[PDB]
Structures are given as C-alpha cells and as structure tokens.
Design a protein around this nucleic acid. Structure first.
Ligand SMILES: Nc1ncnc2c1ncn2[C@@H]1O[C@H](COP(=O)(O)OP(=O)(O)O)[C@@H](O)[C@H]1O
Ligand SMILES: Nc1ncnc2c1ncn2[C@@H]1O[C@H](COP(=O)(O)OP(=O)(O)O)[C@@H](O)[C@H]1O
Ligand SMILES: Nc1ncnc2c1ncn2[C@@H]1O[C@H](COP(=O)(O)OP(=O)(O)O)[C@@H](O)[C@H]1O
Ligand code: ALF
Ligand code: ALF
Ligand code: ALF
Ligand SMILES: [Mg+2]
Ligand SMILES: [Mg+2]
Ligand SMILES: [Mg+2]
Lengths: 448, 448, 448, 72
DNA sequence: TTTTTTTTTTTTT
C-alpha cells in the first residue's frame, strides 16, 4: 500500500500542548483544523476541544474526558488513558506552533494526494464525461488547493502598515502628473470629471432598456480605451456575432453610416475612410473578441487569465451581458445564479487588477411610472447586482418616450451609484447612424 | 486491472481509408498525428505514410508495403496480409473523419490519464519539492492540456482575424447589385427601405391585439417570399387548421371575396381566378404547412432540420404563435417557460441561417391608455421577447378604436425595435375582404 | 436529575464586590435581593449585609465576620476564610452590575421553574378544583412573574409622575439644558440620549439600501470610539480593501474633500491636515483592521479572542457586513445559514462582553411602497436577524428619493428596536464630500 | 408466466438496418422510441444511436461500440 | 424559508 505521509508526533505534541496550555490554542487554530490530523481519534479530540473552548470550558485531562464520555466519543478516541498518554508524551507547548505547521503540511499533502486519486479515477472511468469537464475539474481542484495558500498567514494585526501603505499610494499618485484621470481614460471629458476613469479592481455596470444603446456605449468605451493605452482589452460578446460587432465599430471609428456598411452600398470616399480605420486598428493589435455563447464564470476566468499571461496583463474586460452567463450547479434558483455570477465577476476584477464592465437589463416596472428614468432597483433579477457594483451607469434617451421632446438626439448617462465619488448626470450626443456617442459640446445645462 | 483507452478498430479504419482516397489526407493529418495512436506498429505505419505523402508518393498499399520492406519495418507491422486486413475492416473512407476524431479523443484521454499519473507520482514523492512547486506543476500540466487542444472551442480571437473576415463580407456584398434587399424580399417596397428584407439569422416578431391582422400579415409575408425566391418556406400553424389557412391564401392571391370561398357561392370568374392561383402554386411547390398543436422547441427544430436537409435548405420559417409552444420541463413557471422558448427560437435561426418570424400577443395594459399604439413592453408574458428579438413590427389599425378616424382601411406597421437599422412607421392599405395588405399608394405622410 | 439553573460565580463575585465597595450596595440590592441566590448560605450572607446597611454599619470583612460570629452564622458560611475567598473571587466592585443581572436572571428562571412545578402538581391531582380554579391559578402565577420584574417601559405613566415631570422640566429648561449622556460615547450627543451609548454584550445592527452611508456611518462610530477610550477596536471589512477604508478615514478625520485624496490633487494645506491626523492615530495605535474575504463565524471568534488576549480586551467590534459571512456546513439553506451567523455573533458578543456592530442590507420591497422609510420587516433573508438584534438603526436620506425635498443633506437614524430606552428618530448632517456625519446643529424639528 | 407480446426479430432488423444506412433515421424516429424496444440491451443501443445522431455524427459499429463503452 | 418575475381584480389618494 501507499501510506500517505504523516507525522503523528506533531499531532500528539499539539494535543498535549493544548491540554497543558490552553492559551496557545490560537496557535493551533491559525495553522490546522480538526480534519488535519492523520489519525481519526486526534480529529475527534480536537473537535471536542474546540466545542469545550467555545463554551468557555478549559481544555484539560478531566473536562475533555467528561465531554467525550457525555458525547460517547470517549470510547472511540480510546478513553482517558489515551489522553493521559498524550499528556505524558508532550513535554510542553513551547514549540506547538512548529508542530501545527507540520500537521498543516501533512493535511495539505493528504488533500493533494486525494485530488490526484480522484483525477486518476475520472480518467480511468470518465462515465461519459467529455474532456472539458475533467479540464475544468482539474482547474477547480488546483484553485481549491491554492486557496489555502492565498490568505492564511496574517489577519487584522497592524495599523501602522495600513498607514504606511496608504500614505505611499497617495505620494505615488501625487508625484504622477496626471490630469485627474487615474484609471482608464473613458474618452469623454464630462464623464472623466465625475468618474476619474475606469478604476482598476472595480465592477462597473451599464444598464438600460432594450435598444437604448448598452452595446453602442460599451463598444465606444472599448474603442477609446484601446486607442488611449497599450494593454490588451478583452471583449465577451455572448449575444452578437463578432462580425456584427466589427461592422458597428468600423462605422463608428470611420464615421460612415452603418446602413451602407451593412448593405454594401459604399462609394469611394467611404472606402477611403474605412481603409484609414483598418490601418490604425492593425497597427495597435490589442483588441480580442470572444463571441462564444453561454459561458460559465469559470470559463471567463480561464480565458481572461490566459490572455493576461501571454501579453503581460489586461487593460479592460467587457461582458455583454450579465444575464446570459450560466452556472449549471445553481440552475434551479435563478436569483442565486445571478448572485453567484455577480460575486465571481467582482472577484475576477480584484484578482487581475483590471476594471470589468458588465452590461445588464432592466425591469418592466420602470415603464409603469410617469417618470421613466431608471433607478438602482430596476436591474433585472438583481439580487446583489446593486450591492456589489462600484459604479452604475444608466442610459436614458428622452426622445424615445416623447416624440415632442426638446432633447432631440441627446442621451443622459445617469450615474446611479458610486462608492467613492459623487453621483449626477452627464449629457452626450447620440448619432445612431454611426453607432456612436459624442461629447455634448452644445450648451451645458447645470444638473440639479 | 485498468487498460488505457484506445480504439484499435478506429486506428485500423483511419489507416485503411487513406489508402483508397488520399484527398482526405489533410483532414486526417490536421486532426490527428502519429503520436495519438496507442499501438506502436500503427505509429510506424502512419509515420511511413506521412513520409510517403511528403515525398509525393501516392498513399496506397503497394507504396506502403514497399517503404516498410525497404525500411525493414514490414515484419514488425505484418505484411501484405496484415496491411490488407487493415483496409478490409474499414467501413467507409468518407467516415474517416469520425475515426480520426475518435483517435484524437482516445489520445487526449490517454494524455490526461498520464498527466494524472504524473501528478500522483509527484504528489506522493515530493523529491525535495515543496507544496508550492507541486501546485505549479499541476498548473503547468493543466495549461499544457488546454494548450494541446489547438482551439477546438472558439476561444478569444485577435482583431486581425476578425477584420479580414468582415472586410471580405463587405466586399462581396458590393459585387452583387441587389440595391437595398440584402435579405428575403418582403414584397412591400416601403418596408424594404427600412428592414432591407428579412435578414438571415434574425428573430423577427409580429405582435398586435386579437383580430388586428397578425396572421393575415404573416401569411402575406410568406406568400411573397415563396413567389420571390426558390427555397422552401415552412409554416407552423398551431392556432388554425391547414384548410382555413389555405382558404385565406386562395382569397388573397386570387383576390376573391373570402366569404364566397368559405361559403361556396362562387361564380365563373371566381373559378377562373382560383384556377390561375392553383396553377402557380403547384408550379413552384415550395410551401410546407404543419398544423400540429402544442409543439415543443425540440420538435420544431427537428422538423425544420429535416426539411432543410431534404430540399437543400430553408428560406424562411413562420410560427403562429409563440405563446402556444410548450416546454414540459418548465411548466411551473410560465415566465421561465416563455424565456426558454424565445432562446430556442433565436438559436434555431442561427443554426440554419434563416429568418424566423414568430408572432406574439399583447398585454391588456395597452387598453387602459389614452393612446393605444403598442410599445415594446406590452408583449405578453414577455420576459426576454423584447431582448432577444432583432426586429419587432406592431400592427395597428386606428379604425378599430375610433370609428370616425380618417385612416379608414389604412393599417400601420410600427417598427418598435431594430438592432441594426432605424425605426419608424409604414402605412399599408388593409383589404380585409380579400385578407390582404396592399401598398399604400396615397400621399406619403412624414413620420415623426 | 435536573439541577435547577444558577450561577455560583456570580453569587461569589457579587458578594465580594459588595464587601469591597459599599456605595454600590444599594444598586445591587434593588436589582437583586437575598432570596435571588441559589445557595442558602449566600442568602444568609446577603441578609447579614442588609441588616448592617439598615443599621448603617460599614460592610467589609471585619464587620461581616463580627456580625456572623455574634449571630453564630460564621461557621455556617465556612468562617472568615470563605469571607476572604468571596472577595478574592471578585476582580473588582465596578463589574458588579453584570453579575447582579445574572443573579436576577437565574432567580427569575428558578421562580418560573417553581411555578411550572406547582402548575403540574395541581393538574396531576385536581383534588376537586374546577378547571377554572386551575386556569385562574395559572393566570395569576404568570402575572406575578411578569409583573414582579420592576425594570422600565412597562406601562402607561400615571398622572402624578407626569405633572411633576412637566413642572420639573419646565423649570430646568429655562435655566440650563442639563444633558446627561452618561453612556459609551458614540461621538454624537443627540444619539447618546436615545441609546446611552453602545452597551456591551449587545448585538447592534445597521441597515439601509445600497449607497446610503451604511459603511460611512459605521466607520464614524469606530473612529469616535477609538479617540474617546483606550481599549482596542477591531474591524472586519469583507468588502473593501484596507486601503480604501483608510483613505475614507483620513478624509473624514482631517476634513478634506476625499476626491482630492483619491486622485492625489492635494496642496500644502491639505498635506498639513493629513500629517496632523497621522500623528494622532500613531500616537494611540489601538485600531486593528482585517480585510480577509468570506470569513466564517469560527474564524472571527478565533481572531477576536487572540487580539483580546494579547492586548487585554476589545472595546468594540465592527463587521461589514453580515450577509457576506459564510458557513460551509449550512451551504444549502441560506435562511439557516444567516440564522447560524446571527446566533454566533450574539454568542461571541456576550462571551467577550463587547458591543458587536454588524451591517445588513434590505429587500427591494421597501422601494415599492409610497413611504420608503425602512421597517424591521425589510431586513434581507431575515430569518432571525430581527430576533437576535438588541438595537437596530436604519439610515434614511429623503434627498435620495426627492430632489426638491427640503431635507437636503439631512440623514435620519431610525431606531427600530431597543432593550432599554425609547425608539425614535435622530437627525444628522451628512457631509458626503468628507465621508462623515455631523451633529444636526440646525433647527431641531420636533419628532412626531 | 404468460409470454408478453414482443417481436425480437423486428427489433433486430430495425437496429441492423440503421447501422447500414443513416438516411432512414427519420423514418424510424417518428415510428419508434427507445422505450419501444423490449430487451434492455436493444434499449441501450437505441439510446446511444440517438445520442450519436443528434450529435450529427456517422452511425457505425466502431462509433457505437465506443459510445456504449463510454457509459459502461 | 427566502428572493424574483408575470397576470388579473379590487380599494383608496
Ligand atoms: N442606421 C441607423 N440609424 C438610426 N438608428 C440606428 C441605426 N442603427 C442602429 N440604430 C439604433 O441604435 C440603437 C442601438 O441599440 P443597441 O446598441 O442594440 O442597444 P442594446 O445593446 O442595449 O440592445 C437601436 O435602438 C437602434 O434603433
Ligand atoms: N370577409 C371579411 N371581411 C372583412 N373583414 C374580415 C373578413 N374576414 C376576416 N376579416 C378580418 O380580418 C381580421 C384579422 O384576422 P386574424 O388575422 O385572424 O387576426 P389575428 O390572427 O391577429 O387574431 C379580423 O379582425 C377580421 O375581422
Ligand atoms: N466626494 C463625494 N461627494 C459626494 N458624495 C460622495 C462623495 N464620496 C462619497 N460620496 C457618497 O457617500 C456614500 C457612501 O456610500 P457607502 O457607505 O459605500 O454605501 P453603503 O451604505 O452601501 O456602504 C455614497 O453613496 C456616495 O454617493
Ligand atoms: F438588443 Al439589447 F440589450 F436589448 F442588446
Ligand atoms: F384570433 Al388571433 F391572434 F387573436 F389569431
Ligand atoms: F455600497 Al454598499 F453595501 F451597497 F457598501
Ligand atoms: Mg446589446
Ligand atoms: Mg391569428
Ligand atoms: Mg458599504
């Protein structure tokens, strides 16, 4: 047989130390748990100790024995005699921390051994599973294994370091001669004033009713970001084919009414402008488009990381749109499915340190009011969409609802939420023919 | 014991097939390589086959045997009889793609199993490797597996590739001088100016209140499409029998009061007209009607596929109407059921590259308003009907609501949504007696 | 054999505190009496002290032993050795309030058990008593327990008290305000009156819709508490990084527009203020902040206990926020998951004797009503959140829902539950620019 | 034990023909379903045959053998 | 147990 590696000595030394000195119990708790012990009796003893400590009862040779007898585990663990021997074996809890780390290492080693065993079985007995299923399983297991190594060293501890880290960041920004913009440059001056660009590690959201221009606005931000920096920008078009996205972006950049592009009725001047656009796009070559439909959060993470690894980071990620992503595990409760997707995307932004722009739809309840301007509570199926987002922008075009409105060809970007900035409204011009939003150079109206 | 996966018979078939026809060499070569086989002699044969192909020698039994004999590997792989048996068990060369695909799958599984065994070997014996290194090896191996796939799943695509495809599409659209109608001809020139025909891969929707002409308009679109092209058009009439539909079509095409047709009080001229219509329809023979009730999305897709396969493709398919379809799995929640149906209809359009015209009903909230023209948010039970649709046309006849209206017999096609294109209104004369919508020759009223 | 509940340590601690300090004997006597103990000798001792107080003689070891010896009770209570031991058990006389309350609580439980035993006795042997007699006896006993509690907020005030309060407060008002506060300072004088500060062992709750100052308010409480005491405070920020939290604190304490801090567009004057703030914080060094994500009730307890032991207790604990904690065991029923989380926090709060502030979200039903002020039924997934909470505060800002409202920059704190004291509304000024709340110095509108 | 009415020979002919040709799959899909077959072995083969067909893959002994092997 | 989206009927301002 292949006996998994273990060191019962470390477990026994820890157990004796806990029974001798209960103060050092934190040292054991911060490195190992009840399930890290190779021998099951140790696991039962640790669990009983945790229950007694949580009740305020001291961890000694009498209280632990009494608790085990009451719960009936005193027979399985061996009895008071086994606890007495553990007390004798351990000299003192002076070096308990070292033993705890060893037990943690053994427990980790047991876990990765089990994962290897599970993977081998799956390959030997796929039971009809396709290659992708095992691949994602391997990725998830690796992520789970690395999870214990993510945040397991330190907790709250210092404040001095917090001030040192914080003051350092202010100094770096202060020295950098930037014009207020600190994130990605949106491309619209009025929007940069309020948002100061798309900040890294943020979950931005764009919402509006159908055919308001959620994709038209989002692709404009993508184009501006690509032209105003160097890092790659990644697009997930779960709804429209890559070809249709390109025709819109080809009409916007070159300013050629997309009706001709779609229909092919182009003159010589239009061919000249389209050629100019193609030259610029192919010179940079930092835009990636993925038009696969129905992607799970795991697949989004996998493809985003791969692009970052190859090209040394990402600058922006666009998703179109939230509700189209799938989580097969939570396929019964739609509300829980949407909550899981939102949490994952926020985590992805923090992990890669890159703004994530995800579009969203709106409820019909908006359409039963006299004032049809969206509010935070309109997001569709939005369990936690409002609670997790760092910035929420709504697109409202008045002319859609009132044919006599004076605001003809004007769109309002309503900032519905912002954790670290003011909220308000920004007015832009909408040129549908070119699939473009432009700065509203016209007369400015103060926002109440 | 555990036997690593492999398909000896498939390995035999792939080897056997290419000896007859070598044109499929690229198909086999790109999909699979000599490393994919599990049996060494087969690897030797393919290695010889690739060498002969690279040398310009035709792939055949005689050339293979000669090369093996010269290299001395003929004894290892067998001989004239062994190689003859290789081709004997091949079912068909045309299928070689599946055999090659099978071989790739077996090799992929073997590769995964080997990686799992390698991971287990590394995990069981650290060999001086720390826990972090073991994580790195697992990550590297997983990435290699995801790297060896060679796409096969449509990952993110660079922008250079997308531009090449899009510009090619525009250039070819330039050559064909259709002058406005890129898709199926609707038959109403005022409607083509906006929609530019019914584009393939679209989910068109026609909605209106009961007895507004919803099935009368859709049938007019179907009749015009059938007479203006050559591909079959399929009709799913879940609401009315096939006889009633045909009774209307005879009245429309032949322009005979449908009351006489339904009642039988026909004259000589009416018989002459109907005979003329019958001759035309039987000359083309490209209309199919399926009046089964309560079809599920699966049955709709299966039947459409069969018609496309048998007759070389479809030109248009019409559904009457959306809300009558059933999804037995999701019957507790009507909102989820309708969302599932809408998604399926959009997916079907993409698969067959055909426009799908699905009718829909409207809410009663329209009837509590002073203005009774429909809007997007009136579609009945419509969770995602407004979001998935690429074009929404509403039928509104003002004479129904205001008796003294000036628009007596003038229907309006209100385009409530169009993803790629403008929105507006089109006026058509409504001849209910003939069950027909005609072009409105009257003065053009500018749309606001 | 079921042992009636009691608290021996509380009895011993109360006796020792009374022996040490005599001015607080009245408070203990009012809260608890001799009969409120569980052991007869301790009841005898309490009678001895009450007799001494009636005579006015000082209460201490010498006097207590003298009285016991004269009455012959010295041997009954174990002699002078146990008298000294009673004080030896007591850490200090100031903490006698909590111990007396425990003694009263056990006394109430004992009385309830006795009444229940009497009820069973009568029912088992009617002796001829009619059901009415049994029911009347049970009803009278229940009223005795319910009414024999004193406390406050137990009914409508009569006339004599009202008249004296009316004249007394009229006379006091025209001379001086005479504010008492007398509580664990929250920094806002108007809030101390209605809460008497944050009482230890409670489980305070703060709730509001997204982007309502929920985290801004909690941080202000943490800052004010830190300056006005010496015990360490702890923060569990499960949503925002420690950097962002610290940035807000610097803006709030130094009264500097936080947009400049985020963008780094500071000047010499602002840098002077920030430098002053950093000096004060580092002078104290009693704030600990943990930004680990997805903690569990076990993890927070272990970390909180470790901090307390290292530095000798915690003055306050803040969590942001409740719904983000995770319990893998109960990872199927969210309602049970939240129930366990709330229970664990309450257990920790009383175990350490430290106030615990936990934030929470609200449903979307609030926004459906015409009156948008929160209510206790709006807590999200509130299986037991309302039950365990000892104090609930809601944050409301009418300016959010009404641009023309006259309450611009005014936030209302709505107390929806409280163990002692009334429930009402507290007004404050919300300076979002500095991420701060300020006392509503303006015209204090009478609350209706 | 009264013999339930069933015809193995017809089932064997149907399964074999479908192996020979793929263009008649529609002819049998409407007429029969997996539950129609009497013996469980035939039911398993038809289910695998349908799974391959709806996947748009050719029908043959090798493909069927592998597909059945995948599910055990 | 909780959160979400759709219908239809009543009562009030
Ligand atoms: N050639 C054109 N002329 C005028 N308007 C157009 C043209 N092409 C598209 N539009 C308008 O632009 C809008 C863009 O819609 P879209 O970006 O799809 O919004 P969403 O992505 O939120 O559904 C549509 O409402 C459409 O009416
Ligand atoms: N002989 C006729 N004369 C006048 N109007 C007719 C005649 N036959 C049918 N119609 C009208 O045609 C309209 C459209 O019918 P239909 O297309 O079935 O409505 P929908 O399918 O939208 O429910 C009906 O309102 C009906 O009154
Ligand atoms: N510079 C600023 N000017 C005006 N308002 C601001 C500024 N900075 C922050 N705010 C406001 O302070 C509020 C604090 O939000 P926050 O406490 O994060 O919400 P939550 O209650 O969900 O924690 C935000 O709604 C934001 O609008
Ligand atoms: F067509 Al949409 F958001 F309504 F892309
Ligand atoms: F009669 Al209908 F749609 F209302 F065909
Ligand atoms: F901005 Al929040 F909870 F909505 F911190
Ligand atoms: Mg879109
Ligand atoms: Mg109809
Ligand atoms: Mg917050």
């Amino acid at each position: 047989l292949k006996v998994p590696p273990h060191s019962i000595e470390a477990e026994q030394s820890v157990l004796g130390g806990l029974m001798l000195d209960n103060e050092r119990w934190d040292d054991v708790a911060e490195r190992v748990v009840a399930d890290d012990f190779y021998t099951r009796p140790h696991r039962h003893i640790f669990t009983e100790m945790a229950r007694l400590q949580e009740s305020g009862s001291p961890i000694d040779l009498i209280t632990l024995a009494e608790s085990l007898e009451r719960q009936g585990q005193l027979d399985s663990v061996g009895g008071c005699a086994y606890l007495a021997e553990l007390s004798k074996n351990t000299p003192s809890a002076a070096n308990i921390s070292a033993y705890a780390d060893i037990v943690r290492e053994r427990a980790v080693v047991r876990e990765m051994i089990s994962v290897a065993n599970e993977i081998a079985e799956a390959g030997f007995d796929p039971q009809g599973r396709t290659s992708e299923d095992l691949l994602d399983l391997a990725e998830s297991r690796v992520f789970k294994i690395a999870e214990s190594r993510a945040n397991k060293d330190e907790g709250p501890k210092n404040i001095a370091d917090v001030l040192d880290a914080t003051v350092a960041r202010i100094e770096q920004l202060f020295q950098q001669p930037h014009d207020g913009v600190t994130g990605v440059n949106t491309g619209y001056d009025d929007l940069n004033k309020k948002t100061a660009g798309l900040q890294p590690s943020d979950l931005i959201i764009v919402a509006a009713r159908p055919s308001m221009g959620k994709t038209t606005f989002a692709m404009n931000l993508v184009e501006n970001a690509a032209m105003l920096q160097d890092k790659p920008v990644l697009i997930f078009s779960l709804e429209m084919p890559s070809e249709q996205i390109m025709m819109r972006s080809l009409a916007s950049l070159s300013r050629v009414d997309q009706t001709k592009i779609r229909t092919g009725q182009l003159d010589d001047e239009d061919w000249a402008r389209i050629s100019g656009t193609m030259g610029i796009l192919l010179e940079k070559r930092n835009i990636y488009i993925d038009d696969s439909s129905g992607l799970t959060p795991t697949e989004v993470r996998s493809r985003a990381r791969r692009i970052a690894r190859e090209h040394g980071g990402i600058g922006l990620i666009m998703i179109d749109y939230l509700q189209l992503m799938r989580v097969p595990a939570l396929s019964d409760n739609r509300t829980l499915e949407i909550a899981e997707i939102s949490r994952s995307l926020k985590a992805l932004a923090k992990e890669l340190n890159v703004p994530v722009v995800a579009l969203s739809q709106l409820n019909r309840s908006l359409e039963q009011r006299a004032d049809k301007r969206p509010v935070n509570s309109d997001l569709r199926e939005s369990g936690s969409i409002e609670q997790d987002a760092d910035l929420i922008m709504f697109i409202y075009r008045d002319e859609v609802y009132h044919e006599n409105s004076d605001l003809k060809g004007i769109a309002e970007i309503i900032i519905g939420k912002q954790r670290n900035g003011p909220i308000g409204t920004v007015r832009l011009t909408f040129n549908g023919q070119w699939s473009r939003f432009d700065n509203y150079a016209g007369p400015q109206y103060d926002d109440e």
